[PDB]
RNA sequence: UUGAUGUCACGGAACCUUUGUUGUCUUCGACAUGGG
């Protein structure tokens, strides 16, 4: 193919015409590029006809390229992998020439675009921005500044320079120098060459209030592919003109049409629009924040009735904080707070790990990993569940819903919220909204946690100090006007509050009269309110004990009316949960995976069993089974990093199989008192009361000398779930 | 009033230093400045100039001392001299004025509140913090530490070298960001000096706590420490001018690399190879008629370069200069480095971090482990120097050229192996409070020592290439190179763990056990076998620092950190490592490889071929092994090449949705190759080491020569000797080694299948090792595998065979020749070709086994019909009697040859057989003349009865006058030479010239030699003819391979032999003059009508009988010994050989005409070996069997299909030439072998009638009748035309 | 040439990806020379 083209350009060419010269030069370049790339074209084995004439004209040509590489990557009817390859070829072919003593502008300008567009395509790798991307943007700026040094108002170099500078601002870098000067020249250039420019004229408007450009933005034609972005820009233009009814109309129209992928810059720009309206102290931000939250509820169900998965977005937490602050109804505040809970957020690294495991199990959830479409959403440049009523709570209970508002905290306010629901009161008096500051409670938690990790039971004094901070942060837990005297409490925590023994909060009182919360109220926990689905207990006599724990012999559990397996393997675990036992005990170790919760695993005798494995077991029959867990539930949870972290664990896996209620420890439990505690609950299967009886029995021993070491052993146990 | 304490820091490792920053940027917002606070600083002597010196701040030393004091207080339960300390105070208002804030948890030893912030009686720890006392007055003051005497240096690069430090992703195995620091070597700059000054009110208990904290402080600036109270430039431009003046700058790159190879020793300059015949006329070193050889040998004798360190430096600089010149001789189309290898990322500390307090407790122990790390393979710690650019990849060395094993790399591999033990990755975030996971807490206790070797010889260079899968050749511009450190180097190893458990943690016990077992994979380039160590001679001890008596002994001796203390400690380390409790098997399995080759082997090394004294044009790779101070060479097969062979064996037999894996780009790719062999986006899961030969073989030289298809003589090509390792059926080469495969791969049956199939095809002989498989090298006889638990080898069972049908009878020939006993014939005739040559523009690609095409093996027997000579040209003085001792004075002599033998086994090379069969196949298909001296210029004598054209003709006339072996238009003499206007290529039809030929038009094509489209002027417009499609070209690999032939019977010799007791050697026959062919005879004159006649073939006849009687064929007088005659050892008729041909992706008509060219017909024969015109060399070939590959697992007998293939071949010839097929019957008539009573004479005429006693015409008379110029071509192109 | 009641930088493997490959019978008979 290419050799025949060269032959044609020699049959018809004289070099007193530059079109002949150019068309010849182009053919030689495309020949020699794919000679390097080792395509199938390397099998073309022929040569040129008319040897003496061809030698003459070639030698004349060499005695007397940016134009090509400009044309490539104009075609974009191809995937993100294919875009990435062509951009990299453009870089590695042109990088060699752009560093010449005085390179051409179009060589520099083409290479700058390739660096900018290639920068957009980098896949994140952690909580930080990838370093390759920031370097790519700075490379794009560097070549533009060669062109702008020789010509201060080259429009295309100016626009590439500004596009890269805005991305640096998106990455969390500071603006380059002369940003205002370059943006002023754009305001002198004075026209929208592409819709991607309008955000620059809005930046200019916000920095200088020179409203002249706003008429163009509103006047722009609607027959565009990414209209949802255009309405947001019209909404911003319409705000600066003070036309607030149309700001509302355009704003809602934008959200209603919003893209399904958080990688699209629209979602970041929308949050900044809300936050800008707020800091200007408009009232429009409240409505727009609530509407945006309602749209962001997009997710995947995994197997397991109650467990959800989502893709990571860096500013989602900020939006939910804003929507929570916008909403005034406490019942509606709860639904915003409840929407965060019992949901994992993963990156496109770990989403591929699940895709592999789904493939290994030949499961059609593999197709739900079309979510990796998010990788093809990075570029705007191209221009390309039932709600459980709260009325289902039985009237003899109290329910406490927590939310931790980080934005409200970092602005210096009391960002902790406890939304308390009483089903017995008149319809306007059922909900209370009590707020507290959790900064010192969080610090004392981290202080215990490190002492626990290094010393286990040596941390008992820090645990005791922590339990007093729960009361100090939340005095309302001990007021009868907020939690009436006798009624059981249901906890629905948030963030690091999942780690705390809320049921064991301590009031100091008089020095001889310390008082503990469990002496007043019984307690149960739920990861989230939407897991509420009561059912009766399993109608069987079978009790089963699965052990792989060689350190200890549970003499009180093992010598009884139990189906005991001293060692065990994942096949036996799978088999036992297909028999719907009345009680199932599972006593073994486990290990966490900090990066991917689903790959946390239980230690059985010859083969580890992951949470992913446990969720996906077929033919499970476990509805209404009562379950008791050993060290695995405590050990499969990582050390906390952020206050609003929530981590999946084996208790949540069993609850996804509709288990009745689950007993587990908040930290590693002493085997000798697991032996006693679980024996008592097995003998007297009303867990809610019998656990309180056990705790109020042992608290008499604690009161004798106030041994923190004893409190450390009886505090960890809690009940999860809500049966009929 | 105050008092002063002198202080000095002694460094035990290279310490780190940060870049200089302008005074405005020295603030908390500058990430590069904040990240460098833990390092040493550079002081610019004056702002605008780099001249300066290093220093260390006292603020840094105080911070380390405070950390030490906390640790000593927690051990002593908060009491110093039986006086008590409160926790101290670590919180301020106005945090913004602090440059840094504490991320780590402060330790506690008591629960009491700290002292009031305006009190008088502060406790000792508060005196050390300076809260005691609190224009500004200091209670204890730390000064800066500086080099003794404050010397100055012109910049940081005079003091140290800046080095890139990695961060590798555990899941991918690739680094996504990095940072830089200056490393300053402690041997050059061991000590810094400073002072501490103390106010007189400071208590005695505070003074004790200070001194103990100084002795307990063991690190600063990233290094372990103890605190105590021109010719190369001239020679380059000279050589460059010489190489330019002689117009041979195409060799600049090769000269640059070859001269840089001389770093190893100056003694190599005296050994540089010479020309053939032993003269100083070698094509590189004797450029310049002074020669480069003289320039180097005079540089070698120069006293300024007699020091080995200075010779090394001279060679390095000269190589760099020649390399930096060499690039301009080419278009320079690409940058070879790849994209955005520039991502410098500095960790950012969190200002907002929460304060915490932790107890840790009094139990604290320190375990010391001492040993050695021994390199079991070559290793690569990558450190590029941007001031050196000849090598693409470079290895880390100390400033005095000793090899270094960095601290930073040892920690990085410990952290990797600990995450492997726990089987749980860490998200290795930078900044914020310390990570509390189980791996990070171990690494926070560990300490290791930077180490260096004593060995310091220069690194080896290993060159690497990429193969174009479609053509089977190297890809355009793909050559690149790498430095590596030798195997066998020994490093000191020392590790210390400080923690609360007794002894090491169980995870660390296990990881050290993996290292002791030989799985310390520590360096880069692991996928090609680099960087495997064993920890050896391990010893260990535990110190109980919780004990007050041991703690004070520890403090007294600075923990035995320095070399004096360490020798005292090594007297009381216990032998051996502690056994782990929860042992876990390592992540890699060793698979052991055994390969058998019954053929020669070569794995080429062009730079060695240039430097080595042996002088042959291709030589094998050899690798150097360090033992003590010496380096000793070994022949090996490279890990890179072996990886390439196995990778392509997997690739060619798998697909990704109908596209072969050889055709993909493998970027952002997740196919089978990327999952096993890795990608630019992730590390591979299989590691290949070098293979080595047991029994230590020695190379042997084989010479080769190309034969002009017209004249039948040598074609004066560039010399192409090779020096392979010798192997034969009686003496196979045994290759042994190992490759390491990851545990999760052996556990996957889908990968075991992929490898099993590929290794099955290697075992089947489809993938030869090394170069020159076309002529029978590198033939694998078997591949054996152990250590897989038969998970791979279960697929490698032999294919055996399907059927036992016998090969058909070859047809009887219909050729006829009417010999007449009274007449005399000419020894050779020419086959005149057909006008049409069938060419194709795009051949069959090599990247897969194509459907509808055949792959398999042919096995053959060859039988001598007439005595055969195949000389062993390694020794041309074979038959001189032993008693004529050592007659050698560069006299010239009667040469004498034995028959070709290899390991004393009589054989025929495959290069001979390929060329013999190629010539017939070229003729049967009417191909081009594959070998032909198309740029030769003819001349004739004048009969007795300016433009550059006239100059080139005249200088042709001048050389032919000068170089005449028979001596005792512009013309210098009245009757003289006539020189042709045209090259001999112009006397041949343009379609019969080579498809890939030489330039034969007007004008010098060298004007374009920098530009790639030059190659299109040298290629035919229509592509490749049939022979070039089958046997290949220099731009396209061929599809047939010819093996060596082995004699079956015990030899039958022509002459009975000098020792009756030995049947394995024959006697000599003496031959007549073998003489040059003469194209001036068959192209009689300058006239344009005299075109090239055709392809020469020698006829079959029995003149060899006259020669064994000792008589000359033409005139029956005795043959006489002279330096122009030869004597040889010849086999008789009736000897039988066997050999095998492999073929791949042939069409049925191609295999049909190949078998036809081998087999011929009953009544026809081939010519092989020396002295064809004298009767010798007639052989016949019979096909014994054909075996075909159906797939990787099934092979089948093809004997029943030979009749079909032959038919389709003849059908193809009818399709091309439509019964205009005379050139075949002329060929068969020259392949005819005389029968029974027939006995053609056959011989050349004598130069004159009267010179012949038989009275036949002779040349002088023959030119005047029946061979006049007008008749001569018709005579010579008619087979068996008599001349008398 | 530091600034002090706060420095886990021994907080970070220069890491990952590329067959020195391809093409060539150690072969062999007609002259040489300038005059006249
Ligand atoms: Zn104090
Ligand atoms: Zn970690
Ligand atoms: Zn691939
Ligand atoms: Zn050809």
Residue numbers in the entry:
A (entry chain B): 3 to 66, 78 to 397, 411 to 750
B (entry chain A): 1 to 134, 143 to 237, 260 to 319, 327 to 982, 1230 to 1252, 1286 to 1601
Question: How is this structure described in the published paper?
Answer:
Here, we determine the protein substrate, structure, and mechanism of a type III-E CRISPR-associated protease (CASP) from the marine anaerobe Desulfonema ishimotonii, reveal insight into its natural function in coordinating a transcriptional response to foreign genetic material, and engineer it for novel RNA sensing applications in vitro and in human cells. We identified that the largest protein, Csx30, is specifically cleaved in response to a target RNA. Csx29 consists of a three-helix bundle N-terminal domain (NTD), a TPR domain with eight repeats, and a protease region containing a pseudo-caspase (CHAT1) and active-caspase (CHAT2) domain that resembles separases. In both complexes, Cas7.2-Cas7.4 interface with the NTD, TPR and CHAT1 domains of Csx29.
